[PDB]
mmCIF file of all heavy atoms in Angstrom:
data_model
loop_
_atom_site.group_PDB
_atom_site.id
_atom_site.type_symbol
_atom_site.label_atom_id
_atom_site.label_comp_id
_atom_site.label_asym_id
_atom_site.label_seq_id
_atom_site.Cartn_x
_atom_site.Cartn_y
_atom_site.Cartn_z
ATOM 1 N N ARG A 1 0.754 -1.260 0.000
ATOM 2 C CA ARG A 1 0.000 0.000 0.000
ATOM 3 C C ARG A 1 0.788 1.317 0.000
ATOM 4 O O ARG A 1 0.580 2.178 -0.851
ATOM 5 C CB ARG A 1 -0.963 0.035 1.184
ATOM 6 C CG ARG A 1 -2.421 0.153 0.789
ATOM 7 C CD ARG A 1 -3.308 -0.842 1.525
ATOM 8 N NE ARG A 1 -3.861 -1.930 0.704
ATOM 9 C CZ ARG A 1 -3.371 -2.408 -0.446
ATOM 10 N NH1 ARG A 1 -2.232 -1.988 -0.989
ATOM 11 N NH2 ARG A 1 -4.037 -3.418 -1.007
ATOM 12 N N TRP A 2 1.663 1.508 0.979
ATOM 13 C CA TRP A 2 2.388 2.756 1.066
ATOM 14 C C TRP A 2 1.396 3.831 0.848
ATOM 15 O O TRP A 2 0.203 3.579 0.953
ATOM 16 C CB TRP A 2 3.361 3.022 -0.076
ATOM 17 C CG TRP A 2 3.896 1.812 -0.745
ATOM 18 C CD1 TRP A 2 4.133 1.700 -2.076
ATOM 19 C CD2 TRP A 2 4.324 0.575 -0.144
ATOM 20 N NE1 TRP A 2 4.670 0.463 -2.359
ATOM 21 C CE2 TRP A 2 4.800 -0.252 -1.196
ATOM 22 C CE3 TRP A 2 4.348 0.090 1.161
ATOM 23 C CZ2 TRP A 2 5.283 -1.542 -0.975
ATOM 24 C CZ3 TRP A 2 4.835 -1.179 1.374
ATOM 25 C CH2 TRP A 2 5.290 -1.987 0.323
ATOM 26 N N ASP A 3 1.951 4.970 0.444
ATOM 27 C CA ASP A 3 1.179 6.145 0.122
ATOM 28 C C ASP A 3 0.164 6.366 1.215
ATOM 29 O O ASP A 3 0.345 7.255 2.043
ATOM 30 C CB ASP A 3 0.613 6.032 -1.310
ATOM 31 C CG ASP A 3 1.746 5.784 -2.295
ATOM 32 O OD1 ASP A 3 2.300 4.701 -2.513
ATOM 33 O OD2 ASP A 3 2.132 6.891 -2.856
ATOM 34 N N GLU A 4 -0.862 5.527 1.226
ATOM 35 C CA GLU A 4 -1.905 5.526 2.241
ATOM 36 C C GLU A 4 -1.296 5.166 3.587
ATOM 37 O O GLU A 4 -1.580 5.725 4.629
ATOM 38 C CB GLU A 4 -2.988 4.501 1.849
ATOM 39 C CG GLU A 4 -2.561 3.702 0.591
ATOM 40 C CD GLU A 4 -3.674 2.975 -0.151
ATOM 41 O OE1 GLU A 4 -4.765 2.684 0.349
ATOM 42 O OE2 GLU A 4 -3.331 2.669 -1.395
ATOM 43 N N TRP A 5 -0.400 4.213 3.565
ATOM 44 C CA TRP A 5 0.266 3.828 4.774
ATOM 45 C C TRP A 5 1.156 5.027 5.155
ATOM 46 O O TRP A 5 1.309 5.453 6.316
ATOM 47 C CB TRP A 5 1.026 2.504 4.507
ATOM 48 C CG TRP A 5 1.894 2.045 5.642
ATOM 49 C CD1 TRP A 5 1.577 1.160 6.643
ATOM 50 C CD2 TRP A 5 3.217 2.525 5.897
ATOM 51 N NE1 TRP A 5 2.633 1.072 7.515
ATOM 52 C CE2 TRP A 5 3.644 1.907 7.082
ATOM 53 C CE3 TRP A 5 4.045 3.474 5.238
ATOM 54 C CZ2 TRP A 5 4.904 2.205 7.596
ATOM 55 C CZ3 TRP A 5 5.290 3.781 5.724
ATOM 56 C CH2 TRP A 5 5.694 3.153 6.911
ATOM 57 N N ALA A 6 1.737 5.650 4.140
ATOM 58 C CA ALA A 6 2.574 6.767 4.491
ATOM 59 C C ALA A 6 1.886 7.918 5.185
ATOM 60 O O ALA A 6 2.331 8.434 6.180
ATOM 61 C CB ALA A 6 3.458 7.202 3.339
ATOM 62 N N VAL A 7 0.812 8.357 4.635
ATOM 63 C CA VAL A 7 0.110 9.456 5.237
ATOM 64 C C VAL A 7 -0.270 9.107 6.678
ATOM 65 O O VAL A 7 -0.117 9.917 7.622
ATOM 66 C CB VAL A 7 -1.124 9.791 4.396
ATOM 67 C CG1 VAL A 7 -2.132 10.601 5.210
ATOM 68 C CG2 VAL A 7 -0.706 10.493 3.095
ATOM 69 N N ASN A 8 -0.761 7.880 6.860
ATOM 70 C CA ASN A 8 -1.088 7.484 8.201
ATOM 71 C C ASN A 8 0.072 7.826 9.155
ATOM 72 O O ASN A 8 -0.081 8.473 10.190
ATOM 73 C CB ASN A 8 -1.279 5.981 8.215
ATOM 74 C CG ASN A 8 -2.264 5.614 9.274
ATOM 75 O OD1 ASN A 8 -1.988 4.684 10.064
ATOM 76 N ND2 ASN A 8 -3.365 6.387 9.299
ATOM 77 N N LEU A 9 1.272 7.392 8.779
ATOM 78 C CA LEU A 9 2.481 7.631 9.539
ATOM 79 C C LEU A 9 2.769 9.117 9.829
ATOM 80 O O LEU A 9 3.206 9.486 10.921
ATOM 81 C CB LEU A 9 3.697 6.923 8.893
ATOM 82 C CG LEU A 9 3.574 5.399 8.894
ATOM 83 C CD1 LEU A 9 4.870 4.735 9.330
ATOM 84 C CD2 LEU A 9 2.471 4.967 9.843
ATOM 85 N N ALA A 10 2.520 9.982 8.863
ATOM 86 C CA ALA A 10 2.763 11.390 9.064
ATOM 87 C C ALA A 10 1.848 11.929 10.101
ATOM 88 O O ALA A 10 1.947 13.096 10.497
ATOM 89 C CB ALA A 10 2.535 12.192 7.804
ATOM 90 N N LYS A 11 0.916 11.095 10.511
ATOM 91 C CA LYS A 11 -0.073 11.517 11.495
ATOM 92 C C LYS A 11 0.180 10.873 12.827
ATOM 93 O O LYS A 11 -0.696 10.307 13.473
ATOM 94 C CB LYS A 11 -1.456 11.106 10.987
ATOM 95 C CG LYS A 11 -2.212 12.227 10.273
ATOM 96 C CD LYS A 11 -2.572 11.903 8.825
ATOM 97 C CE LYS A 11 -4.071 11.661 8.599
ATOM 98 N NZ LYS A 11 -4.481 10.238 8.622
ATOM 99 N N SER A 12 1.400 10.929 13.227
ATOM 100 C CA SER A 12 1.758 10.234 14.412
ATOM 101 C C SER A 12 2.679 11.108 15.153
ATOM 102 O O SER A 12 3.378 11.935 14.567
ATOM 103 C CB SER A 12 2.612 9.075 13.910
ATOM 104 O OG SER A 12 3.795 9.577 13.292
ATOM 105 N N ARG A 13 2.707 10.833 16.413
ATOM 106 C CA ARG A 13 3.527 11.599 17.260
ATOM 107 C C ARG A 13 4.949 11.534 16.811
ATOM 108 O O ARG A 13 5.680 12.517 16.777
ATOM 109 C CB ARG A 13 3.568 10.936 18.571
ATOM 110 C CG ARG A 13 4.489 11.870 19.318
ATOM 111 C CD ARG A 13 4.454 11.729 20.861
ATOM 112 N NE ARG A 13 5.678 12.322 21.431
ATOM 113 C CZ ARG A 13 6.394 11.960 22.491
ATOM 114 N NH1 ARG A 13 6.083 10.945 23.316
ATOM 115 N NH2 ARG A 13 7.485 12.682 22.718
ATOM 116 N N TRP A 14 5.350 10.323 16.504
ATOM 117 C CA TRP A 14 6.692 10.053 16.036
ATOM 118 C C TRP A 14 7.132 11.060 14.991
ATOM 119 O O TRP A 14 8.133 11.742 15.061
ATOM 120 C CB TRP A 14 6.686 8.657 15.378
ATOM 121 C CG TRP A 14 7.883 8.318 14.524
ATOM 122 C CD1 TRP A 14 9.182 8.362 14.897
ATOM 123 C CD2 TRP A 14 7.903 7.854 13.165
ATOM 124 N NE1 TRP A 14 10.008 7.934 13.877
ATOM 125 C CE2 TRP A 14 9.262 7.644 12.800
ATOM 126 C CE3 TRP A 14 6.909 7.585 12.238
ATOM 127 C CZ2 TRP A 14 9.642 7.192 11.552
ATOM 128 C CZ3 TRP A 14 7.283 7.096 11.001
ATOM 129 C CH2 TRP A 14 8.623 6.890 10.663
ATOM 130 N N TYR A 15 6.344 11.136 13.966
ATOM 131 C CA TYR A 15 6.616 12.009 12.875
ATOM 132 C C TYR A 15 6.753 13.466 13.301
ATOM 133 O O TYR A 15 7.613 14.227 12.863
ATOM 134 C CB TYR A 15 5.328 11.931 12.103
ATOM 135 C CG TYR A 15 5.397 12.884 10.967
ATOM 136 C CD1 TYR A 15 6.213 12.557 9.891
ATOM 137 C CD2 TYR A 15 4.699 14.091 10.956
ATOM 138 C CE1 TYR A 15 6.297 13.399 8.782
ATOM 139 C CE2 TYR A 15 4.797 14.959 9.867
ATOM 140 C CZ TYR A 15 5.601 14.606 8.780
ATOM 141 O OH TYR A 15 5.707 15.423 7.688
ATOM 142 N N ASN A 16 5.817 13.862 14.141
ATOM 143 C CA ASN A 16 5.736 15.207 14.678
ATOM 144 C C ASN A 16 6.879 15.536 15.591
ATOM 145 O O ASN A 16 7.203 16.683 15.735
ATOM 146 C CB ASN A 16 4.362 15.519 15.351
ATOM 147 C CG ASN A 16 3.257 15.795 14.326
ATOM 148 O OD1 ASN A 16 2.391 14.940 14.051
ATOM 149 N ND2 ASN A 16 3.358 16.963 13.674
ATOM 150 N N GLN A 17 7.509 14.574 16.268
ATOM 151 C CA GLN A 17 8.643 15.030 17.076
ATOM 152 C C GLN A 17 9.975 15.044 16.328
ATOM 153 O O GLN A 17 10.857 15.764 16.742
ATOM 154 C CB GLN A 17 8.789 14.388 18.449
ATOM 155 C CG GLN A 17 7.545 14.601 19.305
ATOM 156 C CD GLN A 17 7.577 15.909 20.050
ATOM 157 O OE1 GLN A 17 6.546 16.617 20.080
ATOM 158 N NE2 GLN A 17 8.757 16.221 20.622
ATOM 159 N N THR A 18 10.117 14.254 15.238
ATOM 160 C CA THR A 18 11.326 14.172 14.407
ATOM 161 C C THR A 18 10.915 14.018 12.976
ATOM 162 O O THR A 18 11.060 12.967 12.405
ATOM 163 C CB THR A 18 12.185 12.944 14.771
ATOM 164 O OG1 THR A 18 11.407 11.755 14.779
ATOM 165 C CG2 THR A 18 12.697 13.137 16.183
ATOM 166 N N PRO A 19 10.384 15.081 12.407
ATOM 167 C CA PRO A 19 9.888 15.094 11.056
ATOM 168 C C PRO A 19 10.949 14.846 10.001
ATOM 169 O O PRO A 19 10.791 13.969 9.162
ATOM 170 C CB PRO A 19 9.133 16.435 10.896
ATOM 171 C CG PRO A 19 9.344 17.280 12.152
ATOM 172 C CD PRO A 19 10.031 16.351 13.141
ATOM 173 N N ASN A 20 12.042 15.577 10.070
ATOM 174 C CA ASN A 20 13.120 15.366 9.135
ATOM 175 C C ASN A 20 13.378 13.909 8.980
ATOM 176 O O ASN A 20 13.240 13.360 7.902
ATOM 177 C CB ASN A 20 14.424 15.920 9.695
ATOM 178 C CG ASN A 20 14.532 17.387 9.408
ATOM 179 O OD1 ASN A 20 13.637 17.961 8.773
ATOM 180 N ND2 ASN A 20 15.652 17.968 9.833
ATOM 181 N N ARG A 21 13.765 13.303 10.094
ATOM 182 C CA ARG A 21 14.044 11.904 10.045
ATOM 183 C C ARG A 21 12.865 11.059 9.650
ATOM 184 O O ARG A 21 13.006 10.101 8.852
ATOM 185 C CB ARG A 21 14.617 11.352 11.322
ATOM 186 C CG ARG A 21 14.433 9.831 11.404
ATOM 187 C CD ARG A 21 15.050 9.221 12.662
ATOM 188 N NE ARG A 21 15.543 7.857 12.524
ATOM 189 C CZ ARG A 21 16.273 7.328 13.491
ATOM 190 N NH1 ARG A 21 16.531 8.058 14.562
ATOM 191 N NH2 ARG A 21 16.763 6.087 13.395
ATOM 192 N N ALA A 22 11.700 11.367 10.254
ATOM 193 C CA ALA A 22 10.539 10.536 9.933
ATOM 194 C C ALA A 22 10.271 10.466 8.419
ATOM 195 O O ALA A 22 9.914 9.452 7.813
ATOM 196 C CB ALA A 22 9.333 10.852 10.786
ATOM 197 N N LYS A 23 10.501 11.583 7.787
ATOM 198 C CA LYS A 23 10.277 11.676 6.377
ATOM 199 C C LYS A 23 11.239 10.851 5.615
ATOM 200 O O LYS A 23 10.867 10.225 4.642
ATOM 201 C CB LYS A 23 10.512 13.094 5.881
ATOM 202 C CG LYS A 23 9.362 13.992 6.250
ATOM 203 C CD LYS A 23 9.417 15.394 5.641
ATOM 204 C CE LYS A 23 8.765 16.473 6.541
ATOM 205 N NZ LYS A 23 8.152 17.639 5.850
ATOM 206 N N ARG A 24 12.489 10.925 6.024
ATOM 207 C CA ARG A 24 13.505 10.205 5.302
ATOM 208 C C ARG A 24 13.196 8.715 5.337
ATOM 209 O O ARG A 24 13.374 7.977 4.379
ATOM 210 C CB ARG A 24 14.795 10.522 5.956
ATOM 211 C CG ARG A 24 15.883 10.816 4.996
ATOM 212 C CD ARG A 24 16.966 11.709 5.625
ATOM 213 N NE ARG A 24 17.231 11.516 7.053
ATOM 214 C CZ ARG A 24 17.335 12.532 7.904
ATOM 215 N NH1 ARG A 24 17.217 13.813 7.559
ATOM 216 N NH2 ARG A 24 17.574 12.257 9.152
ATOM 217 N N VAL A 25 12.649 8.304 6.469
ATOM 218 C CA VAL A 25 12.258 6.946 6.658
ATOM 219 C C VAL A 25 11.016 6.547 5.925
ATOM 220 O O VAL A 25 10.915 5.436 5.434
ATOM 221 C CB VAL A 25 12.041 6.736 8.118
ATOM 222 C CG1 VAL A 25 11.662 5.286 8.345
ATOM 223 C CG2 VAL A 25 13.362 7.077 8.767
ATOM 224 N N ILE A 26 10.025 7.410 5.952
ATOM 225 C CA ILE A 26 8.767 7.127 5.267
ATOM 226 C C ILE A 26 9.044 7.130 3.767
ATOM 227 O O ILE A 26 8.541 6.361 2.967
ATOM 228 C CB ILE A 26 7.698 8.158 5.578
ATOM 229 C CG1 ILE A 26 7.163 7.911 6.960
ATOM 230 C CG2 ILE A 26 6.592 7.996 4.564
ATOM 231 C CD1 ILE A 26 6.246 9.042 7.449
ATOM 232 N N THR A 27 9.914 8.016 3.366
ATOM 233 C CA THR A 27 10.260 8.065 1.987
ATOM 234 C C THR A 27 10.870 6.786 1.479
ATOM 235 O O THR A 27 10.471 6.254 0.452
ATOM 236 C CB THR A 27 11.166 9.243 1.751
ATOM 237 O OG1 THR A 27 10.331 10.390 1.899
ATOM 238 C CG2 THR A 27 11.797 9.070 0.369
ATOM 239 N N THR A 28 11.814 6.292 2.245
ATOM 240 C CA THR A 28 12.526 5.081 1.918
ATOM 241 C C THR A 28 11.583 3.904 1.766
ATOM 242 O O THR A 28 11.689 3.174 0.805
ATOM 243 C CB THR A 28 13.531 4.851 3.029
ATOM 244 O OG1 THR A 28 14.436 5.943 2.996
ATOM 245 C CG2 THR A 28 14.252 3.551 2.743
#
């Protein structure tokens, strides 16, 4: 799935406390 799974992830605390990194990871 991704994409959909990705957005879900951007909606998490995790992402919000370390976005730079979270993105690099979600991107990968």
Side-chain angles (χ1 to χ4, degrees):
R1 241 133 250 23
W2 333 142
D3 305 80
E4 6 198 340
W5 174 95
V7 161
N8 210 228
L9 296 225
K11 263 120 109 264
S12 64
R13 179 163 161 215
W14 165 55
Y15 175 73
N16 283 103
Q17 302 274 136
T18 51
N20 276 359
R21 160 178 211 170
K23 284 188 211 210
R24 224 155 34 226
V25 182
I26 284 171
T27 289
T28 297

